[PDB]
Paper text:
Computer-aided enzyme engineering performed by Tournier et al. introduced an Ile at [name] position F243 to enhance the enzyme’s catalytic activity by further expanding the substrate-binding site. Additionally, thermostability was increased to 94 °C by disulfide bond formation between D238C and S283C in combination with mutation Y127G. In this study, ICCG was utilized for the application of a crystal contact engineering strategy to increase crystallizability and test the rationality of the applied approach.
Here, orthorhombic ICCG crystals grew in 2 out of 384 tested reservoir solutions within two weeks: 3 crystals (50–100 µm) grew in 0.8 M succinic acid (pH 7.0), and 12 crystals (50–100 µm) grew in 1.0 M succinic acid, 1% (w/v) PEG 2000, 0.1 M HEPES (pH 7.0). Additionally, the cutinase ICCG is not easily crystallizable, as the success rate of the HTP screening process shows (2/384 conditions). As a result, crystallization was not reproducible for ICCG in batch experiments with the crystallization conditions obtained from HTP screening, tested using 0.4–1.8 M succinic acid and 0–5% PEG 2000 (2.5–10 g L−1 protein). Molecular structure analysis revealed a change in the crystal system for ICCG (space group I222) and ICCGY (space group P41212). Also, the two space groups are formed by varying crystal contacts, resulting in different neighboring amino acids for L50 and L50Y. Given the complexity of the crystallization process, with many factors affecting the crystal symmetry, the changing space group could result from the difference in protein solution homogeneity and thus, potentially varying oligomeric states.
Numbering used by the authors: 1 to 259
The structure:
Amino acid sequence: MSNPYQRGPNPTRSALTADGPFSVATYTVSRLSVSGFGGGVIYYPTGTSLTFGGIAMSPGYTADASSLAWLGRRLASHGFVVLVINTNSRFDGPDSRASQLSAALNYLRTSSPSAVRARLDANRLAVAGHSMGGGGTLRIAEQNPSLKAAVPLTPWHTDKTFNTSVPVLIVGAEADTVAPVSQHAIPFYQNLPSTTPKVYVELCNASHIAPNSNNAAISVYTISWMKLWVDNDTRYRQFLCNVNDPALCDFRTNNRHCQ
């Protein structure tokens, strides 16, 4: 076997900025059915009988899974099972959101409808989250080394050091005034262990709400990082190596993923 996990056509930067090749179905996880997180929406591939890796995603300065619907759908369409949670509360802090992400991942493994479980390879799991949720991503990554990848988006957290070996790609927003890049995203990046694969990208002319609507840069880098590590799909290395992107105002990496 070459790469059992590889999915979809050969990628072009262009295709990575709109919904991908797989058809997508959704399933609402009602708040009324689960314990350690609010509800959620699972986005998953139909029209295929391959299994995909799984992603749990936390919303940002709200409880609403709808705020990241575009990106749950987006990642799904490129070949993922994606559970976007609602949080228990509007005001849940990063560490509680880490708990909720944990619960959503267990939900995916143990509790999802048969339609979903069928598309899912529960051995290949990753996390993403906006803001507060992004801080959660770092915490949960620190606690579960078996996660494939973490993608914090304009992350916010009071703690600055996370001891994780999970590959991290952080998206900062240059004009973010709620989680300023130099007090949040960049410290997170710098404090990760030296041996962990990591990338920081900073969106020019974007604020904390940048992840809340369709966004080409967030799309390209999130899809590529997920593909690279969840799927071991090195065809995605090209979007994360020798990067040159006018959308970006900063780019930092230890370049372990270009090996």
